[PDB]
Coordinates of C-alpha atoms and ligand atoms in Angstrom, one line a residue:
Chain A
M28 CA -175.3 102.0 -10.3
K29 CA -176.6 98.9 -8.4
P30 CA -175.8 95.4 -9.6
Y31 CA -179.3 94.8 -11.0
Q32 CA -179.0 98.0 -13.1
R33 CA -175.8 96.8 -14.6
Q34 CA -177.5 93.5 -15.3
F35 CA -180.4 95.3 -17.0
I36 CA -178.0 97.4 -19.1
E37 CA -176.1 94.3 -20.3
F38 CA -179.4 92.6 -21.0
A39 CA -180.6 95.5 -23.2
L40 CA -177.3 95.7 -25.0
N41 CA -177.0 92.0 -25.6
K42 CA -180.4 92.5 -27.5
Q43 CA -179.3 95.5 -29.5
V44 CA -182.1 97.5 -27.8
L45 CA -179.9 100.7 -27.7
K46 CA -179.5 102.1 -31.2
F47 CA -177.5 105.0 -32.5
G48 CA -178.4 107.1 -35.5
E49 CA -180.6 110.0 -36.7
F50 CA -183.9 109.5 -34.8
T51 CA -186.9 111.8 -34.6
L52 CA -188.6 111.1 -31.2
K53 CA -192.3 111.1 -30.4
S54 CA -191.8 114.6 -29.2
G55 CA -190.2 115.6 -32.5
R56 CA -186.7 115.9 -30.9
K57 CA -183.8 114.8 -33.2
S58 CA -182.0 112.2 -31.1
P59 CA -178.7 110.5 -31.7
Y60 CA -179.8 107.4 -29.8
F61 CA -183.0 105.4 -29.3
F62 CA -184.0 102.7 -26.8
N63 CA -186.2 100.2 -28.6
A64 CA -187.9 97.9 -26.1
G65 CA -189.6 96.2 -29.0
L66 CA -186.3 94.4 -29.5
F67 CA -186.7 92.3 -26.3
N68 CA -188.2 90.0 -29.0
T69 CA -188.2 86.4 -27.6
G70 CA -190.0 84.7 -24.8
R71 CA -186.9 84.6 -22.7
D72 CA -186.5 88.4 -23.2
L73 CA -190.1 89.1 -22.4
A74 CA -190.0 86.9 -19.3
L75 CA -186.9 88.6 -17.8
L76 CA -188.2 92.0 -18.7
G77 CA -191.3 91.4 -16.7
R78 CA -189.3 90.2 -13.8
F79 CA -187.3 93.5 -13.8
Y80 CA -190.5 95.6 -13.9
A81 CA -192.3 93.6 -11.2
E82 CA -189.2 93.8 -8.9
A83 CA -189.1 97.6 -9.3
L84 CA -192.9 97.8 -8.7
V85 CA -192.8 95.8 -5.5
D86 CA -189.7 97.6 -4.3
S87 CA -191.2 101.0 -4.8
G88 CA -194.0 100.6 -2.3
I89 CA -196.3 102.6 -4.5
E90 CA -199.9 101.5 -4.0
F91 CA -201.9 100.8 -7.2
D92 CA -205.1 98.9 -8.1
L93 CA -204.5 98.3 -11.8
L94 CA -201.6 98.1 -14.4
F95 CA -202.1 100.1 -17.6
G96 CA -199.9 99.8 -20.7
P97 CA -200.2 102.4 -23.4
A98 CA -200.2 101.0 -27.0
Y99 CA -198.1 99.8 -28.5
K100 CA -194.9 99.2 -26.4
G101 CA -196.8 99.2 -23.2
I102 CA -199.0 96.2 -24.3
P103 CA -196.4 93.4 -24.1
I104 CA -194.7 95.3 -21.2
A105 CA -197.9 95.4 -19.1
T106 CA -198.7 91.8 -20.0
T107 CA -195.4 90.3 -18.9
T108 CA -195.1 92.7 -15.8
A109 CA -198.6 91.5 -14.7
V110 CA -197.5 87.8 -15.2
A111 CA -194.3 88.4 -13.3
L112 CA -196.2 89.9 -10.4
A113 CA -198.5 86.9 -10.1
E114 CA -195.8 84.2 -10.7
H115 CA -193.0 85.7 -8.5
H116 CA -194.6 88.0 -6.0
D117 CA -198.0 86.4 -5.4
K118 CA -199.7 89.6 -6.5
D119 CA -202.7 89.2 -8.8
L120 CA -203.4 92.5 -10.5
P121 CA -206.0 93.5 -13.0
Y122 CA -204.4 94.8 -16.1
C123 CA -205.6 96.9 -19.0
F124 CA -204.4 98.5 -22.3
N125 CA -205.7 100.7 -25.0
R126 CA -205.9 100.7 -28.8
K127 CA -203.7 103.4 -30.5
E128 CA -206.6 104.3 -32.8
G129 CA -211.0 104.9 -26.1
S130 CA -211.3 101.2 -26.8
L131 CA -209.8 99.1 -24.0
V132 CA -208.7 95.5 -23.6
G133 CA -208.6 93.8 -20.2
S134 CA -210.0 94.7 -16.8
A135 CA -212.2 97.8 -16.2
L136 CA -210.0 100.9 -16.0
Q137 CA -210.7 102.0 -12.5
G138 CA -208.8 102.8 -9.3
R139 CA -205.3 104.0 -8.7
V140 CA -203.4 103.2 -12.0
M141 CA -199.8 102.2 -12.4
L142 CA -198.8 102.9 -15.9
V143 CA -195.9 100.9 -17.3
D144 CA -194.1 101.9 -20.4
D145 CA -190.7 101.6 -22.1
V146 CA -189.2 105.1 -21.7
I147 CA -190.1 108.7 -20.7
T148 CA -188.7 111.5 -22.8
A149 CA -191.0 114.6 -22.8
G150 CA -194.0 112.8 -21.1
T151 CA -196.2 112.9 -24.2
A152 CA -197.4 109.3 -23.9
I153 CA -198.2 109.7 -20.2
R154 CA -200.3 112.8 -21.0
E155 CA -202.1 110.9 -23.8
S156 CA -202.8 108.0 -21.5
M157 CA -204.1 110.3 -18.8
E158 CA -206.8 111.5 -21.2
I159 CA -208.0 107.9 -21.4
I160 CA -207.5 107.2 -17.7
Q161 CA -209.4 110.4 -16.6
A162 CA -212.1 109.5 -19.2
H163 CA -212.8 106.4 -17.2
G164 CA -212.8 108.1 -13.9
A165 CA -209.6 106.5 -12.7
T166 CA -206.5 108.3 -11.2
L167 CA -202.7 107.9 -11.7
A168 CA -200.8 106.5 -8.8
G169 CA -197.5 106.0 -10.6
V170 CA -195.4 105.5 -13.7
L171 CA -192.7 102.9 -14.2
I172 CA -190.4 102.8 -17.3
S173 CA -187.3 101.0 -18.3
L174 CA -185.3 104.1 -19.1
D175 CA -185.7 107.7 -17.7
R176 CA -184.0 109.7 -20.5
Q177 CA -183.8 112.6 -18.1
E178 CA -185.0 115.2 -20.5
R179 CA -187.2 118.3 -20.0
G180 CA -190.9 118.1 -20.6
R181 CA -193.0 120.8 -22.2
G182 CA -191.2 123.4 -20.2
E183 CA -187.9 123.8 -18.3
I184 CA -188.5 121.2 -15.6
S185 CA -187.9 117.5 -16.2
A186 CA -190.6 115.4 -17.8
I187 CA -190.8 113.4 -14.6
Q188 CA -191.2 116.4 -12.3
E189 CA -193.9 117.8 -14.7
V190 CA -195.9 114.5 -14.6
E191 CA -195.6 114.1 -10.9
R192 CA -196.6 117.8 -10.5
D193 CA -199.6 117.5 -12.9
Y194 CA -201.1 114.2 -11.7
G195 CA -199.7 113.9 -8.2
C196 CA -198.0 110.6 -9.0
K197 CA -194.6 109.1 -8.5
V198 CA -192.5 108.1 -11.5
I199 CA -189.8 105.4 -11.1
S200 CA -187.4 103.9 -13.6
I201 CA -185.2 100.8 -13.7
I202 CA -182.3 102.9 -15.1
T203 CA -181.6 106.5 -16.1
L204 CA -179.6 107.8 -19.0
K205 CA -176.9 108.6 -16.5
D206 CA -176.6 104.9 -15.6
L207 CA -176.5 103.9 -19.2
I208 CA -173.7 106.5 -19.9
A209 CA -171.7 105.5 -16.9
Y210 CA -171.8 101.9 -18.2
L211 CA -170.8 102.9 -21.7
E212 CA -167.9 104.9 -20.5
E213 CA -166.3 101.5 -19.8
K214 CA -166.8 100.2 -23.3
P215 CA -164.5 100.9 -26.4
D216 CA -165.5 102.6 -29.6
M217 CA -168.2 104.5 -27.7
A218 CA -166.5 107.9 -27.5
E219 CA -168.2 109.3 -30.6
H220 CA -171.6 108.0 -29.6
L221 CA -171.2 109.4 -26.1
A222 CA -170.1 112.7 -27.4
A223 CA -173.2 112.8 -29.6
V224 CA -175.4 112.0 -26.6
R225 CA -173.8 114.8 -24.6
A226 CA -174.3 117.3 -27.4
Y227 CA -178.0 116.2 -27.4
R228 CA -178.3 116.5 -23.6
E229 CA -176.9 120.0 -23.6
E230 CA -180.1 120.9 -25.4
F231 CA -182.8 118.8 -23.8
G232 CA -181.1 117.3 -20.7
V233 CA -182.0 118.3 -17.1
Chain B
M222 CA -208.5 64.1 -22.0
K223 CA -205.1 65.2 -20.8
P224 CA -204.9 66.7 -17.3
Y225 CA -204.1 70.2 -18.6
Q226 CA -207.3 70.2 -20.7
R227 CA -209.3 69.2 -17.6
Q228 CA -207.4 71.9 -15.7
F229 CA -208.1 74.5 -18.4
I230 CA -211.8 73.8 -18.2
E231 CA -211.9 74.3 -14.5
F232 CA -209.8 77.5 -14.9
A233 CA -212.2 78.8 -17.5
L234 CA -215.2 77.9 -15.3
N235 CA -213.6 79.5 -12.3
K236 CA -213.1 82.9 -14.0
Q237 CA -216.5 82.8 -15.6
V238 CA -214.9 82.7 -19.1
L239 CA -216.9 79.5 -19.7
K240 CA -220.6 79.9 -18.8
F241 CA -223.9 78.2 -19.6
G242 CA -227.3 79.6 -20.6
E243 CA -228.7 81.2 -23.7
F244 CA -226.3 83.2 -25.9
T245 CA -226.9 84.5 -29.5
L246 CA -223.7 83.8 -31.4
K247 CA -222.5 85.9 -34.3
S248 CA -224.2 83.5 -36.7
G249 CA -227.4 84.2 -34.9
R250 CA -227.7 80.7 -33.3
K251 CA -228.8 80.2 -29.7
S252 CA -226.0 78.5 -27.8
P253 CA -226.4 76.9 -24.3
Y254 CA -222.9 78.0 -23.4
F255 CA -220.5 80.8 -24.2
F256 CA -216.7 81.2 -24.0
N257 CA -215.5 84.8 -23.4
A258 CA -211.7 84.6 -23.3
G259 CA -211.7 88.4 -22.6
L260 CA -212.6 87.6 -19.0
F261 CA -209.0 86.4 -18.4
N262 CA -207.9 89.8 -17.4
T263 CA -205.6 89.8 -14.4
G264 CA -201.9 89.0 -14.1
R265 CA -202.6 85.5 -12.7
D266 CA -205.2 84.8 -15.4
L267 CA -202.6 85.9 -18.0
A268 CA -199.9 83.8 -16.4
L269 CA -202.1 80.6 -16.3
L270 CA -203.5 81.2 -19.7
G271 CA -200.1 81.4 -21.2
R272 CA -199.1 78.1 -19.4
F273 CA -202.2 76.4 -20.9
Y274 CA -201.4 77.7 -24.4
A275 CA -197.8 76.5 -24.0
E276 CA -199.0 73.1 -22.8
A277 CA -201.2 72.8 -25.9
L278 CA -198.4 73.8 -28.3
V279 CA -195.9 71.4 -26.7
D280 CA -198.6 68.6 -26.7
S281 CA -199.3 69.1 -30.5
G282 CA -195.5 68.8 -31.3
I283 CA -196.0 71.1 -34.3
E284 CA -192.8 72.9 -35.3
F285 CA -192.7 76.7 -35.7
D286 CA -190.1 79.5 -35.7
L287 CA -192.2 82.5 -34.6
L288 CA -195.2 83.3 -32.4
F289 CA -197.4 86.0 -34.0
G290 CA -200.1 87.8 -32.1
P291 CA -202.3 90.0 -34.2
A292 CA -203.4 93.4 -32.9
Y293 CA -204.9 93.8 -30.5
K294 CA -206.3 90.8 -28.6
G295 CA -203.5 88.6 -29.8
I296 CA -200.7 90.7 -28.4
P297 CA -201.1 89.7 -24.8
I298 CA -201.8 86.1 -25.6
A299 CA -198.7 85.7 -27.8
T300 CA -196.7 87.6 -25.1
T301 CA -197.8 85.4 -22.1
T302 CA -197.5 82.3 -24.3
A303 CA -194.0 83.2 -25.3
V304 CA -193.1 83.7 -21.6
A305 CA -194.6 80.4 -20.6
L306 CA -192.7 78.5 -23.2
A307 CA -189.4 80.0 -22.1
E308 CA -190.1 79.7 -18.3
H309 CA -191.7 76.3 -18.1
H310 CA -190.6 74.4 -21.2
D311 CA -187.1 75.9 -21.8
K312 CA -188.2 76.9 -25.3
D313 CA -187.1 80.4 -26.2
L314 CA -189.2 81.6 -29.1
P315 CA -189.2 84.9 -31.1
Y316 CA -192.5 86.7 -31.0
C317 CA -194.0 89.5 -33.2
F318 CA -197.2 91.5 -33.5
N319 CA -198.4 94.1 -35.9
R320 CA -199.4 97.8 -35.6
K321 CA -202.7 98.8 -37.1
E322 CA -200.9 101.7 -38.8
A323 CA -197.2 102.6 -39.5
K324 CA -195.3 104.5 -36.9
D325 CA -194.4 108.0 -38.3
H326 CA -191.2 108.5 -36.2
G327 CA -188.8 106.6 -34.0
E328 CA -188.0 103.2 -35.4
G329 CA -191.0 103.4 -37.8
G330 CA -192.4 100.3 -39.5
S331 CA -195.6 98.3 -38.9
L332 CA -194.2 95.4 -36.9
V333 CA -193.0 95.1 -33.3
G334 CA -190.6 92.5 -32.0
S335 CA -189.1 90.0 -34.4
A336 CA -188.9 89.9 -38.2
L337 CA -191.9 88.1 -39.7
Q338 CA -190.2 85.0 -41.2
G339 CA -190.3 81.2 -41.2
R340 CA -193.0 78.9 -40.0
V341 CA -195.4 81.2 -38.1
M342 CA -197.7 80.1 -35.3
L343 CA -200.6 82.5 -35.2
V344 CA -201.9 82.9 -31.6
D345 CA -205.6 83.8 -30.9
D346 CA -208.5 83.1 -28.6
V347 CA -211.3 81.8 -30.9
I348 CA -212.2 81.7 -34.6
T349 CA -215.9 82.4 -35.4
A350 CA -216.4 83.7 -39.0
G351 CA -213.1 82.2 -39.9
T352 CA -212.1 85.3 -41.9
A353 CA -210.2 87.4 -39.3
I354 CA -207.3 85.1 -40.2
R355 CA -207.2 86.3 -43.8
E356 CA -206.1 89.7 -42.6
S357 CA -203.2 88.3 -40.6
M358 CA -202.4 85.9 -43.4
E359 CA -202.1 88.9 -45.7
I360 CA -199.4 90.4 -43.4
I361 CA -197.6 87.0 -43.1
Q362 CA -197.5 86.7 -46.9
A363 CA -196.4 90.3 -47.4
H364 CA -193.3 89.3 -45.4
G365 CA -192.8 86.0 -47.3
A366 CA -193.4 83.8 -44.3
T367 CA -195.7 80.8 -44.1
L368 CA -198.6 80.0 -41.8
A369 CA -197.6 76.8 -40.0
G370 CA -200.5 76.9 -37.5
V371 CA -203.1 78.7 -35.5
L372 CA -203.3 78.4 -31.8
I373 CA -206.7 78.9 -30.2
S374 CA -208.3 78.4 -26.7
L375 CA -211.5 76.6 -27.7
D376 CA -212.7 74.9 -30.8
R377 CA -216.5 75.1 -30.8
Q378 CA -216.5 72.4 -33.5
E379 CA -219.7 73.7 -35.2
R380 CA -220.2 74.1 -38.9
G381 CA -219.8 77.6 -40.4
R382 CA -222.1 78.9 -43.1
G383 CA -222.0 75.6 -45.0
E384 CA -221.3 72.1 -43.9
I385 CA -217.7 72.5 -42.6
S386 CA -216.5 74.3 -39.5
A387 CA -214.8 77.7 -39.3
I388 CA -211.6 75.9 -38.1
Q389 CA -211.8 73.4 -41.0
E390 CA -212.3 76.3 -43.4
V391 CA -209.1 77.9 -42.1
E392 CA -207.1 74.6 -42.4
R393 CA -208.3 74.0 -45.9
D394 CA -207.9 77.6 -47.1
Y395 CA -204.5 78.1 -45.6
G396 CA -203.1 74.6 -45.3
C397 CA -202.1 75.0 -41.7
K398 CA -202.9 73.1 -38.5
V399 CA -205.2 74.6 -35.9
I400 CA -204.1 73.8 -32.3
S401 CA -206.8 74.1 -29.6
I402 CA -206.4 73.8 -25.9
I403 CA -209.9 72.1 -25.7
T404 CA -212.9 71.3 -27.9
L405 CA -216.7 71.1 -27.5
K406 CA -216.2 67.4 -27.1
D407 CA -213.8 68.0 -24.1
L408 CA -216.5 70.2 -22.6
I409 CA -219.1 67.5 -23.0
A410 CA -216.7 64.9 -21.5
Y411 CA -216.1 67.3 -18.6
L412 CA -219.7 67.9 -17.8
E413 CA -220.2 64.1 -18.0
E414 CA -218.0 63.7 -14.9
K415 CA -219.9 66.4 -12.9
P416 CA -223.3 65.1 -11.9
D417 CA -224.6 68.5 -11.0
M418 CA -224.0 69.8 -14.5
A419 CA -226.6 67.3 -15.8
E420 CA -229.1 69.8 -17.2
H421 CA -226.4 71.8 -19.0
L422 CA -224.8 68.7 -20.4
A423 CA -228.1 67.8 -22.1
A424 CA -228.5 71.2 -23.6
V425 CA -224.9 71.2 -24.9
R426 CA -225.5 67.7 -26.4
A427 CA -228.6 68.9 -28.2
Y428 CA -226.7 71.9 -29.7
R429 CA -223.8 69.7 -30.8
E430 CA -226.2 67.3 -32.4
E431 CA -227.7 70.0 -34.6
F432 CA -224.7 72.2 -35.3
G433 CA -221.7 70.0 -34.4
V434 CA -218.9 68.8 -36.7
Ligands
PRP226 O1 -192.3 110.6 -23.0 P1 -192.7 110.7 -24.5 O2 -192.2 112.1 -25.1 O3 -194.1 110.5 -24.8 O4 -191.7 109.7 -25.3 C1 -191.7 108.3 -25.0 C2 -192.9 107.5 -25.6 O5 -192.7 107.5 -27.1 C3 -192.8 106.1 -27.5 O6 -194.2 105.8 -27.9 P2 -194.6 105.9 -29.5 O7 -196.1 106.1 -29.5 O8 -193.8 106.9 -30.1 O9 -194.3 104.4 -29.9 P3 -195.2 103.0 -30.0 O10 -196.3 103.2 -30.9 O11 -194.2 102.0 -30.5 O12 -195.5 102.7 -28.6 C4 -192.4 105.3 -26.3 O13 -193.0 104.0 -26.4 C5 -193.0 106.1 -25.1 O14 -194.4 105.7 -25.0
ORO227 O1 -188.9 109.7 -27.1 C1 -189.2 108.8 -27.9 O2 -190.0 108.7 -28.8 C2 -188.4 107.5 -27.6 C3 -187.1 107.5 -27.2 C4 -186.4 106.2 -26.9 O3 -185.3 106.1 -26.5 N1 -187.2 105.1 -27.2 C5 -188.5 105.0 -27.6 O4 -189.1 104.0 -27.9 N2 -189.1 106.3 -27.8
ORO228 O1 -219.5 82.2 -32.5 C1 -219.6 83.1 -31.7 O2 -220.2 84.2 -31.8 C2 -218.8 82.9 -30.4 C3 -218.9 81.8 -29.6 C4 -218.1 81.7 -28.4 O3 -218.2 80.7 -27.6 N1 -217.3 82.8 -28.1 C5 -217.1 83.9 -28.9 O4 -216.3 84.9 -28.5 N2 -217.9 84.0 -30.0
MG229 MG1 -195.5 104.1 -26.7

């Protein structure tokens, strides 16, 4: 784990973004933990979050012509990421997002799209976004999320490998479940939660 | 006017958000100028727009405890505005936005971000009919909070369906204060300084005379 990843983890934890309980994921999976990016709830949180995303984007070297954020979590995420790119990297990118109701807000959806979202579990959201992206004649160059939960997709291979294989894109993340776990191994009163996570990973992990 | 207002006008003009000609408004009137805030659609546009909104909020001095951006157009505005306040004014504010429908899994609920509480600053681009606010007010009330103000980009300052303006209708029907980056009068004052904008200035003056205030 690099220093910036440790910083991101501590940032997320200081904001109670990582929750433990009986959750039912978008994919229907019953998870013992949930990463809620909606909890980066103040302007300072949003600002820093965008800085993390922009840094990852520029460091990746992936070429893209537009930033797309799927509703709803992707909306504030794409907005602050777009702002960070312009303010700190001198990169002025057209941005776009959809209505969850398709109907789009922002620039025209064209070119090589960089989709930014909070997490990737089974790859459902990415698949839903692609319906919209392909409907506008655009392509998918990459996907960047805060947390790669490192779970399988619709089959046996990881959700990431499936997405990369299906759309010929590159998926990158700020941190992975592994990084999060390594960090938590250092903290007290986490044993039970970590055990629960492992039990879960034995079933959907890859 | 303040420098940020002058700067906002040039910015809007630059990105073609503000344009002159003949446009049929929702009311059916023929306006000699139109403001399409939806044209601010790149990262830099978003960055600057948030800086201007923040300037306008700080200028007003109105106190608030939450920045609320109604779905969907208000989400990016509230987001970039929240970022500008924290980055350029050292004012860290909670933000929040609504979902059009409840989430059937995960964290559930119909709100994203902060809890809807306290003196809310509603963030938007423009107010035409002056009724889209009622919907957001409903949500704000459903959570027991109060509407402290409404932040918009441009106040067209033209009467609604009867005598008063859409903005004045909002302030009287909700008891809040509407903060605007600029107004029709600021536009007139701007064109006044630019000699080439002579013919447009005249058309905008005529329109304000007939529909203004
Ligand atoms: O890789 P996946 O299996 O698709 O899981 C992750 C996705 O699920 C959540 O969206 P969701 O629509 O559930 O929440 P939102 O409406 O708050 O964005 C999350 O924001 C990701 O987009
Ligand atoms: O898979 C999901 O629905 C999911 C998992 C998670 O950790 N966070 C989130 O917002 N969604
Ligand atoms: O009143 C309107 O229809 C209207 C005027 C304007 O300048 N901008 C906008 O979006 N609507
Ligand atoms: Mg989502």
